[PDB]
Design a binder for this molecule. Structure first.
Ligand SMILES: *[C@@H]1O[C@H](CO)[C@@H](O[C@@H]2O[C@H](CO)[C@@H](O[C@@H]3O[C@H](CO[C@H]4O[C@H](CO)[C@@H](O)[C@H](O)[C@@H]4O)[C@@H](O)[C@H](O[C@H]4O[C@H](CO)[C@@H](O)[C@H](O)[C@@H]4O)[C@@H]3O)[C@H](O)[C@H]2NC(C)=O)[C@H](O)[C@H]1NC(C)=O
Ligand SMILES: *[C@@H]1O[C@H](CO)[C@@H](O[C@@H]2O[C@H](CO)[C@@H](O[C@@H]3O[C@H](CO[C@H]4O[C@H](CO)[C@@H](O)[C@H](O)[C@@H]4O)[C@@H](O)[C@H](O[C@H]4O[C@H](CO)[C@@H](O)[C@H](O)[C@@H]4O)[C@@H]3O)[C@H](O)[C@H]2NC(C)=O)[C@H](O)[C@H]1NC(C)=O
Lengths: 356, 356
């Protein structure tokens, strides 16, 4: 089942929810990858301190092996994140920009009831050079109270990051441009008798004179207008992310003018295709992941799997004991635990103290 | 001279420029601080490799001293950046959100000329139960072509990050809320003769019959209306950032409903007060900055200024020679330069190779 989330966009408010939810999904992908990097850098500082506290040459080289491995994979992953990060943030920014746009248009398109001003009566005058009576209104306004989008339980279940993996997204749905550009209104004129410039009784927000002027054109001669409603109807449109063959993004820029929906579809397509690679979590590393890691062959040689097990352990249970558990369990004292210490104000000073 | 930039905001387009320029200023402050951290972390990896390549105990401890110093100040600065980062990004996001809002409202407020539809003639009908003639229009619209903000040389000189240091900012200027909420229009009705439901000649986008219907109410009986212009005038408003005493932010939330301008002023105030502390640049460190650094007293003792000069040099010229120049000049070979190598895919492997 593809396009669960986009297929739930049927209104300005649900497009706003989709756009903000997808932007947050891209932002969270980046935050998760950067958190993984930060955890890895914290583990490298932890092993650096443990290396300095070792008195055994072979245990020292073991910590060195983990430091080298962690630096390699984490520096690489940080460099490889930058492209996908920029692509995903470009889309997140555009999606947030669009959601802001739609919400501002929603507020104006809610201004659906007019307040008339007191008119001024005339005879012929532009744009009615042939009239004998005119009734001129200046500064009619329409304003709505503060609007807000209300979402149901199902809106939040369907338009949800859980349904925004790249494998299920093939299109976006957007509100038509006229909602963002066009004022629409109905209006009606009414006449009775022989309205002229002397129809200057304005108590009913129209032009009356003669007889007994009052409600419902009470007077002999009357002219007026009313703006009976305003507001442009929202419509929805679909835009595909991919070409017909499904690999390539469909709406690449630089080929001629594009509509907002096409620019957004292109950015979303590129952000979906820009997959992030997260490196191994050093702080929860297992023995098998370490000796299976392609990078440890050249590292272990420099400092093969048989050798790695002799350095790091025959079971993961003792690998955990010797190399993982100390980060949160080994207490360091001088004048905190390892990993907290090496992410603290005294991190460098703990290292200097123990290398002497 | 305070408020050069805000005092140049006199139009929706210049408020948009101010809001986007200030958001970019906050974002650039964060990017600059994070670049400084990344440079420092790169220097720490560089000295780590040089430590591994040293055969001399005292030169090894010297590199260790720089590693410990760099870890201390850079980890601390990274932790201290997080609060100010969040505060500045909260303001940048809000400013961008506002600029999006204003730009969307600008497009709609540019829709200032109406297109009439063909009316339908009637007799009495709501909301003119007392009329003898009515002329009813449905779906009158107004749309503008695509609007764009054009800025002069001086607009870009005055509304500029160069004028957005916290010491010179005391207020923000914003467009009044009615620009974002209210449709405004003028309209006029015209009548001639005795218009009724038989005034059904619509060729002039009004209701005519009798005689020779045509331009300018050519016919005997005529009724019509025109919407002669639309668009709400932008006004500007000032909001102070600080209380009267000047220390505290003026528009703290949680004290009752606030207007957009007050929420923005509060965020800007907090972002201005959230100063970033950037640590020393390790890659351009001088001897005097090192031995003067408060952190090096406990570090040098562990591994006093007299001792530091004996370890790092009597002049900065030899400190540069021994500890700074090698990062970009010392070539490392095995089967690149130091600093590039230790930020490369082979960073960890270079370290492992040389510690053996
Ligand atoms: C860019 O333009 C958009 C569109 O105009 C603006 O979006 C509006 O922003 C305002 C302020 O955030 C929104 O108003 C807020 O709505 C919240 C939810 O409203 C409903 O739901 C609550 C229950 O959750 C009901 O109680 C309520 O009756 C509604 O049914 C309210 O909870 C907020 O209230 C808080 O602030 C107000 C005003 O300060 C106080 O009076 C309240 O006591 C309380 O403190 C608030 O009303 C509005 O809904 C948004 N509109 C849309 C269409 O999204 C952006 O603000 C604007 N951005 C910038 C930066 O300019
Ligand atoms: C949220 O809502 C806002 C407000 O509506 C939208 O902002 C508009 O965005 C569009 C598209 O970016 C802007 O249109 C662009 O304007 C550029 C500058 O226009 C002028 O200056 C150039 C010279 O620099 C003159 O040649 C030109 O005549 C104008 O005087 C143009 O350079 C852009 O042209 C490019 O795209 C168009 C359309 O695809 C092509 O036809 C062109 O050939 C060229 O490829 C473009 O016209 C518009 O100005 C913005 N309006 C405002 C008020 O800021 C946001 O787009 C919207 N955001 C989202 C994400 O929904």
């Amino acid at each position: 089942a593809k396009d669960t989330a986009a297929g739930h966009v049927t209104t300005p408010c649900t497009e706003i929810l989709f756009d903000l939810t997808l932007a947050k999904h891209y932002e969270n992908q980046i935050q998760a990858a950067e958190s993984a990097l930060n955890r890895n850098y914290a583990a490298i500082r932890s092993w650096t301190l443990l290396e300095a506290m070792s008195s055994d040459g072979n245990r020292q080289n073991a910590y060195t092996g983990l430091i080298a491995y962690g630096i390699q994979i984490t520096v690489n992953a940080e460099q490889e994140l930058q492209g996908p990060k920029q692509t995903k943030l470009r889309a997140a920014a555009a999606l947030r920009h669009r959601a802001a746009n739609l919400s501002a248009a929603l507020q104006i398109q809610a201004a659906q009831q007019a307040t008339l001003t007191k008119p001024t009566a005339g005879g012929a005058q532009t744009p009615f050079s042939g009239a004998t009576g005119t009734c001129k209104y200046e500064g009619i306004t329409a304003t709505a109270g503060e609007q807000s989008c209300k979402y149901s339980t199902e809106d939040e279940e369907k338009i949800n990051a859980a349904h925004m993996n790249p494998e299920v997204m093939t299109q976006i749905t957007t509100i038509g441009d006229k909602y963002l550009t066009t004022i629409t209104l109905d209006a009606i004129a009414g006449s009775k008798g022989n309205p002229t410039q002397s129809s200057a009784t304005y108590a009913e927000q129209d032009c009356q004179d003669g007889g007994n002027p009052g409600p419902n054109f009470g007077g002999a001669n009357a002219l007026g207008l009313q703006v009976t409603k305003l507001g442009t109807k929202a419509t929805t449109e679909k835009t595909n992310l991919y070409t017909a063959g499904g690999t390539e993004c469909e709406h690449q820029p630089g080929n001629g003018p594009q509509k907002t929906k096409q620019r957004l579809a292109y950015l979303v397509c590129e952000a979906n295709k820009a997959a992030i690679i997260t490196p191994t979590d050093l702080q929860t590393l297992t023995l098998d992941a370490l000796i299976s890691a392609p990078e440890m062959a050249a590292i272990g040689d420099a400092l093969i799997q048989q050798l790695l097990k002799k350095a790091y352990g025959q079971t993961n249970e003792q690998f955990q004991k010797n190399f993982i558990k100390p980060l949160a369990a080994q207490t360091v004292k001088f004048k905190n635990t390892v990993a907290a210490l090496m992410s603290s104000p005294n991190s460098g000073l703990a290292l200097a103290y123990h290398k002497g």
